[PDB]
Structure 1
Amino acid sequence: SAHLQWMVVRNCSSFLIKRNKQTYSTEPNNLKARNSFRYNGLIHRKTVGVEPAADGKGVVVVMKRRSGQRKPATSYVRTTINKNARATLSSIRHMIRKNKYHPDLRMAAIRRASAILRSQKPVMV
């Protein structure tokens, strides 16, 4: 019913903020903000998200478990990736595609993980 629970929340004030003629969404597992119903993590059955690691260095990738019903305590599987920048992309690029796991977000996830790893050093430009 992924579509159905999107028809309910497509505009109902949950996480959306609408200002200056731009629409944004603030969820966990949303690899952008501007778009919707392709990057929500609350909605779909298999959602991948890339967020900065807690320890301050590196990045964290979170996949959603498919097996097991909606038990939010153990729905999401987390992992830590602390490599050089290039191998970090290969890890994330490998996981999304070679698992065939929701490959809509292969390209969006890579760019998300780059900027997360970019800001974890002195600014480059």
Structure 2
Amino acid sequence: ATSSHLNWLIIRNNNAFLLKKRDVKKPFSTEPNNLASVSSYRYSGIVHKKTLGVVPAADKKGFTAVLKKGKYAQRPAKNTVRVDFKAGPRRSLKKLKNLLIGSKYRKDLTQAALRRASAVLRSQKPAPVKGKKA
């Protein structure tokens, strides 16, 4: 039936998001829940509710709306849709990363998720900078 290892050996190579690029030995998934965008087994669309990712924002720049996994109340046979929950920290460029370790404890993506929210918060910022040089 359903387990993230049976699901994955069907998906391992014949995927629709895996899009390997030309020298680099078999990686890249273009998934919406990958956060370290290769294709591992436990960076994946569905690995069954270890499925966290980090998305901006919607309002650039402050947010990073984080789709937290919508878990084991779901099989995840769908939900009267629930299973992405989107709790989105904001308002401080380096406080919210403590408030993401503070948030989740699902210690497998944890240092590879706030490695991503930083790398979104590195990117959304630079509007009032990179200007004058007078």
Whether the TM-score (by the shorter chain) exceeds 0.5 is: yes
Counterpart of 1:86 in structure 2 is 94
Structure 1 segments of 4+ aligned residues over 3 angstroms from their partners: none
Contact 2:18 2:39 in 1 (8 A): no
The alpha carbon displacement at 1:79 in A equals 1.5
1:1-125 matched pairs, under 5 angstroms: 1-22=3-24, 23-57=27-61, 58-64=63-69, 65-69=71-75, 70-71=77-78, 73-97=81-105, 102-122=106-126
Aligned residues: 121
Mark the CA change 1:21 to 1:44 in structure 2 (over 3 Å): closer, same or farther: farther
3-state SS of 2:20 partner: strand
Percent identity between matched residues is 40
Amino acid at match of 1:19: K
Judging by fraction of residues, say which structure has more strand.
1
Query: After superposition, what is the alpha-carbon deviation per residue over 1:34-54, rounded to whole angstroms, capped at 9, x for unaligned?
Result: 241111132223321111111
More helix by share: 1
Q: SS in structure 2 opposite 1:24?
A: coil
Taking structure 2 as the reference length, the TM-score comes to: 0.81
Q: Secondary structure at the match of 1:74?
A: coil
User: Which residue identity is paired with 1:63?
Assistant: K
Shift of 1:86: 1.3
Per the TM alignment, residue 107 of structure 1 is displaced from its structure 2 partner at its CA by 0.5
Kindly state the Cα deviation for residue 62 of structure 1 after the two structures are TM-superposed. Answer: 1.2
Change beyond 3 A, Cα 1:68–1:107: same
Gaps of at least 5 residues in structure 2 are none
**Secondary structure, in 3 states, of the residue corresponding to 2:54?**
strand
SS of the residue 1:103 aligns to? coil
Q: Note if contact 1:27-1:42 (Cα within 8 Å) is conserved in structure 2.
A: no
Gaps of 5+ in 1: none
| Structure-2 separation of matches of 1:34 and 1:19 | 11
